[PDB]
């Protein structure tokens, strides 16, 4: 299995831990996507120069805390953050 | 960093190992993208039972091989492949 694959695995795993710990097997509520992100991308978030971006995401995650979401949704939000940070993941 | 953030970074790196080879430096042509996937998702791919999920994506990429896509495009294409392989990323 490839280098790229292994990291993808890593992220699936973490995502998967959250969903299971909070109820469902491969979806996780919005509410607890907000805590995921804020804990796990915290470095990255700090790095974002335009906070209006996560403010949104979040002012959106809070807005409907119970809707389950799947990894694809997850990863997508992870990436949007990622862009806003200019792909700096670092304290 | 964070396990997650460490994985993100590793991924961005792979992407840049690619992006950096031709043309513009933080993007690539879809033709290149198709090459990225063939090599770096190879088994996730050989692990997707519906052989049309990729096929179609690959068609899309051939049909406009010159068009430039960034990390976001990449990643969200990845997300699709992962989902189609129910997250099997080993041979
Ligand atoms: Na390039």
From Swiss-Prot, chains A, B:
Show the InterPro entries listed in the entry.
EF-hand-dom_pair, EF_hand_dom, S100/CaBP7/8-like_CS, S100_Ca-bd_sub
- Provide one Gene Ontology biological process annotation: inflammatory response
Ligand binding (Ca(2+) 1): 19, 22, 24, 27, 32
- CDD domains, per database record: calgranulins
Q: Where is this region: Hinge domain?
A: 38-53
Q: Which GO terms describe its cellular component?
A: cytoplasm; cytoskeleton; cytosol; extracellular region; nucleus; plasma membrane; secretory granule lumen
Entry function: S100A12 is a calcium-, zinc- and copper-binding protein which plays a prominent role in the regulation of inflammatory processes and immune response. Its pro-inflammatory activity involves recruitment of leukocytes, promotion of cytokine and chemokine production, and regulation of leukocyte adhesion and migration. Acts as an alarmin or a danger associated molecular pattern (DAMP) molecule and stimulates innate immune cells via binding to receptor for advanced glycation endproducts (AGER).
What's in the domain note? The hinge domain contributes significantly to its chemotactic properties.
- The residue ranges of the EF-hand domain are 13-48, 49-84
Lineage summary: Eukaryota, Metazoa, Chordata, Craniata, Vertebrata
Tissues where the protein occurs: Predominantly expressed by neutrophils, monocytes and activated macrophages. Expressed by eosinophils and macrophages in asthmatic airways in regions where mast cells accumulate. Found in high concentrations in the serum of patients suffering from various inflammatory disorders, such as rheumatoid arthritis, psoriatic arthritis, Crohn's disease, ulcerative colitis, and Kawasaki disease.
Q: Which PROSITE patterns match?
A: EF_HAND_2, S100_CABP
Source domain of life? Eukaryota
Gene field: S100A12
Quaternary structure (record): Homodimer. Homooligomer (tetramer or hexamer) in the presence of calcium, zinc and copper ions. Interacts with AGER and both calcium and zinc are essential for the interaction. Interacts with CACYBP in a calcium-dependent manner.
Q: What is this protein called?
A: Protein S100-A12
SMART domains in the record: S_100
A GO molecular function for this record?
Answer: copper ion binding
Q: Where does Zn(2+) bind?
A: 16, 26, 86, 90
Q: Where does Cu cation bind?
A: 16, 26, 86, 90
Q: Where in the cell is it found?
A: Secreted; Cytoplasm; Cytoplasm, Cytoskeleton; Cell membrane
- UniProt main location, coarse: secreted
Write out the entry's keywords from A to Z.
Antibiotic, Antimicrobial, Calcium, Cell membrane, Copper, Cytoplasm, Cytoskeleton, Fungicide, Immunity, Inflammatory response, Innate immunity, Membrane, Metal-binding, Repeat, Secreted, Zinc
Residue positions binding Ca(2+) 2 = 62, 64, 66, 68, 73
